[PDB]
Design a protein around this nucleic acid. Sequence first.
RNA 1: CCCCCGUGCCCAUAGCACUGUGGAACCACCCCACCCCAUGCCGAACUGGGUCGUGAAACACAGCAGCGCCAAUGAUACUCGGACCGCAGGGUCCCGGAAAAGUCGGUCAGCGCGGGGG
RNA 2: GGGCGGUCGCCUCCCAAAAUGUAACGGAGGCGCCCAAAGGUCACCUCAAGACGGUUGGAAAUCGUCUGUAGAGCGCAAAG
RNA 3: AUGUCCUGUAGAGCACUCACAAGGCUAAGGGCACGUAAUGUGUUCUAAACCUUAUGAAACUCCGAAGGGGCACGCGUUUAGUCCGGGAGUGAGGCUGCGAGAGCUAACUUCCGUAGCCGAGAGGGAAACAACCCAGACCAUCAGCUAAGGUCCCUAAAUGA
Lengths: 173, 53, 111, 55, 86, 124
Amino acid sequence: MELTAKPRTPKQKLDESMIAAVAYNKENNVSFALDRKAFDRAFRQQSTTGLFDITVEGGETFPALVKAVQMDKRKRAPIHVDFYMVTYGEPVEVSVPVHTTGRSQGEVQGGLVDIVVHNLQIVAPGPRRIPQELVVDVTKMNIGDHITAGDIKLPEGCTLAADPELTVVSVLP
Amino acid sequence: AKDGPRIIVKMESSAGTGFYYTTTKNRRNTQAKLELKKYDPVAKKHVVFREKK
Amino acid sequence: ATTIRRKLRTRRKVRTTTAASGRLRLSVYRSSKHIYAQIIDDSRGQTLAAASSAALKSGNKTDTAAAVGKALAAAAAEKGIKQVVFDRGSYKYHGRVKALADAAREGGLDF
Amino acid sequence: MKIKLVRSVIGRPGNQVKTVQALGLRKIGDSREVSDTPAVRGMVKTVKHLLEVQE
Amino acid sequence: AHKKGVGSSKNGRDSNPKYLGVKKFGGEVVKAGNILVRQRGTKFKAGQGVGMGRDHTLFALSDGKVVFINKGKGARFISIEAAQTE
Amino acid sequence: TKFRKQFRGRMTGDAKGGDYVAFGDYGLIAMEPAWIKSNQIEACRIVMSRHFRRGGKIYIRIFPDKPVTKKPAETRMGKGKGAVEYWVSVVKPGRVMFEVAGVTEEQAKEAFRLAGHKLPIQTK
RNA sequence: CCCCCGUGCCCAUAGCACUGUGGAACCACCCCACCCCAUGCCGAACUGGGUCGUGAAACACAGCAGCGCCAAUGAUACUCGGACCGCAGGGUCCCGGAAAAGUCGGUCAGCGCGGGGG
RNA sequence: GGGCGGUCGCCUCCCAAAAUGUAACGGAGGCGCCCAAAGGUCACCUCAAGACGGUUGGAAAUCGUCUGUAGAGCGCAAAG
RNA sequence: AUGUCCUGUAGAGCACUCACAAGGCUAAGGGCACGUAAUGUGUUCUAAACCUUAUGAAACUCCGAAGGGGCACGCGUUUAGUCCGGGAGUGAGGCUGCGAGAGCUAACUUCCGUAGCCGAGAGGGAAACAACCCAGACCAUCAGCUAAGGUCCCUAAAUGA
């Protein structure tokens, strides 16, 4: 949970336990690193939920969040991802997930566990933060109800992307 | 290049003292036998051209 | 239709003063107020002076164009005075294209 | 001010070979200096790890 | 000849592209761009076409002739810095 | 069960791909373009549905690519003929993702069945 | 330093929407209509003559993110090249060139250029 | 490979290995024209396409309208 | 070294091409339904498809280069830039790298080009063995070192750390 490191090359980015790391804060670029022990505390319970600190080698203190999740393609060795830090005035990419949880009231006619396989949501968030509080998956899966993406329990404010009408959880047992 | 009144046309102008056949065609849409024209010949100006054989 | 129609002749005009540069340009304006002229030599140029009223003032469309066609066909044509010119012909040809150009060579210009 | 040469031969494409038609030099055992053309400061940097400081 | 199904036995065909003048090279009225065998005048190949572009070139001598309506000819007045004479 | 016609063609080449997505439950990805005989993936879901349940629907992230052209064998010294084989080929994409619980990956246990190569399940 | 018919540079750091305003010199409508011009029909944006009236959306000006639009050396993706893991892909380091989205900002500019004014 | 069949000229490329840049019993569309005018000049007009409801009008053919990286069409593959 | 212009692969990405997944909505859509002047009333589901979520690619788009060519500035090695002619060869190759084509990405099978190699020269390594790591010679010396290969032996070289 410290920092230091420097290497402007993909040397110590492809050597056992490490990563690559990226930073672009207001007058703060460079490509650090850090090990990879309890470096999978992203999508666990810290997904924007709360924001500690870090104590970087030398100056300042930037809280920041997690900046979505990513893990690793196929394997499980998260190749370099990303990392947001609130100190910019206009990027995108928000992490507002939509899960699947419960006993699945699908045995009413025919239907299994809340599927969903995507990894993208209609979201927006002004500044850069991405709070942690939302459901959408439940609400009596049957007919004359449904619960998808279009408004819901929505972060804080409204939404902005292109055309508010994705798909996500839905029902259709 | 074929022969037998069906497709293709075989007409080719005629001009007095303006020796030239015009050497091009089209088709029998328009009248047959008769074939009024005008247009330049050897050079000079335009000459006869009235079609016939 | 003007700021939607007027587009036919613009770059297609400048193609004799820029494809030969041997002929002048020509402003040409509606307004039906004043008349003026204001030309510039060669497509690679667009700056020259002119004048105004302080002559004969009584608004018109027809007999008011042919006027400057000679009334001011050298008053502003300082450079060379005359040196192979071409008319604009933006819009149609009501007669302001006639009575102007047909009163152009009246005083000066070789068209 | 006193220049030398690297240490390699085969295993090098013709691109670097264009350092031969530039600065004529046979073998490696004995290397030498050079004119005064900074526009050559980038005509050896291919396999730099082979030469020395300048001795 | 004669053919049918389940077999085939037909030829194939192309032609010579042959671009010619190779950019920043003297000038004159060479040719270049046989995209269209009929071709046309050009005077001085600026490198036109749809969208912003035009071949960084500038090198007076004579006319040019080039390509089709595809990209673009030139005809520009300008040598490169020269403009007075020769 | 892929295209319906739209002419034959295609060539070869191996590497990886691009079709991995952060899964919502319990993922599963390929790892390079392994071996699945089409008429193997023609026994991918049914084998993953011996009796998982009366009903039940989840999600996959692939689709049959294929044709190959194998030709007889009376005297191989010619051109070609037609596909008559078929194959999927992939990268490290998702293909299962359960949403139940205790079962975990029972149907991602005999998925590796029809899999001469290595295809972990992972999770997300 | 004023408003302002206009020619470029240009080519969405001038697409649209919100407030209001100037009319007398800038610019719109209009008026009269048979005649130059004669509009697929008529003359309405293509017509000959102009002093009411008004500037209402269209003509102008600045404030003006709701999304566009320019948006970075910085990590990735891509790459002339060097030995290698290694199965073709794929991959480590050394190691140059060096996308894009995302980070801020700004967006309704700006300079010469022909004028009707206190 | 014999060879029945299948092949024998030109044109579109895929694969051709970002200048040129080949092959093939590897693959797909055809032809050896048109036109006195889809030729030259000057002029005005943005095309499929949805919506508004109204005709012989159980869609659709009629018209007004905004939208229209214009998605028409420009003589018959194809690229530009 | 440098000036200057482009090709547009690799990829991103998508919005004209072919298709791709989920949600809102779409039935000008269709039929299960006691109707029944369009059916005004009502319903249920893809489906075209707009937005969103956000898919693929040799033959996709306002993106974008390695490299390469064009000439120019200048010299480092040498005739490199520079045609007319007496006369060749014999047209039917192989392999590793670079990628595809017919192809259970199989074949010192077959087509292609690009460096090398053997058709015109030997070795160490490789058990000896055309392209593989190193290296291509004027004839003679039981003179030296480098790279590969090796440091236990049959035939060299520390079972040195």
